[PDB]
Design a protein around this ligand. Structure first.
Ligand SMILES: Nc1ccn([C@@H]2O[C@H](COP(=O)(O)OP(=O)(O)O)[C@@H](O)[C@H]2O)c(=O)n1
Length: 394
């Protein structure tokens, strides 16, 4: 097979019947559906073009320099930036403060709860790998469980592969006019094993492996719901499993979210056996995400200096110094949390809070009582990174 060629998907005609009656008549009389059958890739090789190798290489240059930055706050921020962007791809959205409240346990905004869930699902899936530990099917199921646990009427089977026939697009009530039909459920176990073997290889360039592992995951589409968010989480798991990263996540979903149809497009093209758009999308996305994350690392470091110009003189060991010290790792803190977390009298801690509030370091996220506080510059860097990455995707 040529350069950037890949074994293409085949089709097969399966019987299909509506389990839940509704839709139009055409949905109800439909008796047959054409499923796509992805290749088995665990043993496949891919030779790819030079211009693409350079692009992958330039992405890895940035990914490597990002991962070698020695910093408080950075790792958590990047993880959350990726999760927020990955959720935005499935139109699960909320404001910065909605999300900050949800990170602290707030539950009134179900979108922000899901955004926090996708954050857990990525954090736990990456935690499981290259402690010489391979990518395991257990971590994928646990990540899906973490994401879909509190989901309404969708999290009924959180943590289990689908047992029914799904499809993407077309009719709401049948696979009529679907743009893609994943393989039948009785083949998902055979396919995930093949993928998990493929995702554990060490004889492929890391970005190519990540990129094809994602596309293949999306082609299998093993879950009833959530395949975008868990499938994208697998990208950074492969990065971490190969040592391509070690201490931080690459937030490429912020680049993907900026050109969504092109991303979905690379999945269609993968299925037809062309690797070039998938890998170019992955190389450009990773390059932009890592480059801007590096600038975010500088800016995060400039922030404490910014904070204390604002707050004025601070005594070298007061509460105000103790507090100002911890905020970079922990930018979302309640008054009772801070008082707990600082060795100092609980009412001189409550003074440092008021001082940081009055100087503009802290902003209130709750009225409540046990007021929850957010480091504004940290919360706004979270948001500025995402805009800068979307901007730099041309
Ligand atoms: N032509 C397309 C378009 C999207 N997709 C993937 O399907 C993901 C959506 O996941 P999903 O089908 O589980 O829907 P949700 O349950 O996450 O809302 C997208 O984020 C893409 O990765 C695909 O495989 N082929």
């Amino acid at each position: 097979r040529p350069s950037d060629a890949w074994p293409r998907h085949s089709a097969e005609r399966r019987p299909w019947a509506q389990t839940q009656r509704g839709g139009t008549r055409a949905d109800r009389t439909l008796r047959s559906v054409t499923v796509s059958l992805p290749p088995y890739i665990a043993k496949v090789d891919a030779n790819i073009d030079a211009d693409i190798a350079v692009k992958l290489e330039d992405a890895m240059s940035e990914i490597s320099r990002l991962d070698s930055t020695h910093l408080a706050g950075l790792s958590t921020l990047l993880l959350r930036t990726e999760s927020v962007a990955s959720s935005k791809i499935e139109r699960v959205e909320a404001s910065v403060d909605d999300y900050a409240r949800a990170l602290h346990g707030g539950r009134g905004n179900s979108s922000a709860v899901s955004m926090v869930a996708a954050t857990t699902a990525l954090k736990e899936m990456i935690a499981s790998v290259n402690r010489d530990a391979p990518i395991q099917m257990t971590a994928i199921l646990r990540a899906h469980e973490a994401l879909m646990r509190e989901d309404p009427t969708e999290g009924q089977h959180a943590g289990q592969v689908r047992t029914v026939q799904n499809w993407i697009g077309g009719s709401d009530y049948s696979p009529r006019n679907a743009l893609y039909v994943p393989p039948p459920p009785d083949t998902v176990h055979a396919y995930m094993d093949d993928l998990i073997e493929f995702a554990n290889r060490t004889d492929i360039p890391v970005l190519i492996q990540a990129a094809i592992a994602h596309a293949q995951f999306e082609s299998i589409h093993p879950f009833t719901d959530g395949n975008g968010r868990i499938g994208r989480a697998l990208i950074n798991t492969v990065l971490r499993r190969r040592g391509a990263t070690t201490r931080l996540v690459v937030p490429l979903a912020s680049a993907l979210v900026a050109h969504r149809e092109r991303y979905f497009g690379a999945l269609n093209t993968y299925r037809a056996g062309d690797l070039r758009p998938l890998i170019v999308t992955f190389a450009n996305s990773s390059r932009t995400a890592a480059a801007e994350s590096r600038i975010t690392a500088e800016r995060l470091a400039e922030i404490p200096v910014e904070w204390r110009n604002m707050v004025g003189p601070i005594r070298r060991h007061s509460a105000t110094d103790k507090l100002l010290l911890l905020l970079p790792s922990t930018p979302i803190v309640s008054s009772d949390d801070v008082a707990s977390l600082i060795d100092a009298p609980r009412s001189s801690v409550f003074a440092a809070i008021k001082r940081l509030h009055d100087t503009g370091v802290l902003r209130p996220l709750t009225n409540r009582r046990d007021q929850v506080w957010g480091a504004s510059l940290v919360l706004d860097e979270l948001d500025d990174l995402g805009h800068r990455i979307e901007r730099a995707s041309a």
